């Protein structure tokens, strides 16, 4: 390939990681007072298809977050992508598989690469721009792959995959070349994962409290287990590089990666109101801004984390009122803040403005 030994690969990973470790260290712009809202788009989608948000370092040294929804019809994949209010586009790419089978996981890679995981650990890589098949890949592992991601800046010759018992490997986009850095355990049983900014730390987790962080650059080093009591719905590595935010059903737990495993950045926060109940919410990738929706009152509520007081408080100046949503995502590029409200098979995109 280009890397002949794992030792050679590990050195390329550390090097590339050190290239970008000092970049992307400026803060995203502070959120303004949001008073208006606009329903931009109502579409159907296939919720069973898990899509990981794609992160890109921008010229202002902070990260853009692209969120994607997929709708799978008759040999075609319909994508809706955005990183803010003005970057909403819908793309149609062909589904390379037989019988219109749905992918289990879809993720992006650099150079317009589209990673499609099908059950049985079979991966198809497409060029979303040219509609060509680039790779047909099989991963030899008895366990189901539950994480797949390609970093946009660090070690961009490979993408990452992980199965539900902790096998972690890298796969070359162009060559039949791969390297395993962690092998299967088993207490565990993971459902998802998330990669740290510097692409050296990978967190694998499950809804029932399990959270293990693996070090990708030192093979088979014991993973660290973080104490969560509680129902995990998402784990995020905040863009500042030292917060690990654990979004639960009605609690927010934030770990400080600089200290001993288990040390919190601030006291655990309870979501008001669960009723509880159908209130849903989402935190942006800065870990400082939060939007919550209430089905009962059809209202969006904005919370802000105060570094001084170390807790979340509601911004009362944001009276946002608007259809039964069960989940949501938030985006906030310089084009405007948008909230993606989701049911179990459709979504509405809501532009929020001052």
Swiss-Prot record:
Q: Which organism is it from?
A: Saccharomyces cerevisiae (strain ATCC 204508 / S288c) (Baker's yeast)
Its annotated pathway?
Protein modification; protein ubiquitination
Q: What is this protein called?
A: Pre-mRNA-processing factor 19
The gene name on file is PRP19
Position of the signal peptide:
none
**Which reaction is recorded as catalysed by this protein?**
S-ubiquitinyl-[E2 ubiquitin-conjugating enzyme]-L-cysteine + [acceptor protein]-L-lysine = [E2 ubiquitin-conjugating enzyme]-L-cysteine + N(6)-ubiquitinyl-[acceptor protein]-L-lysine
Q: What is its EC number?
A: 2.3.2.27
What is the protein's quaternary organization? Homotetramer. Component of the NTC complex (or PRP19-associated complex), composed of at least CEF1, CLF1, ISY1, NTC20, SNT309, SYF1, SYF2, and PRP19.
What is the top EC class of this enzyme, as a single word?
A: transferase
One GO process term, biological-process aspect: protein K63-linked ubiquitination
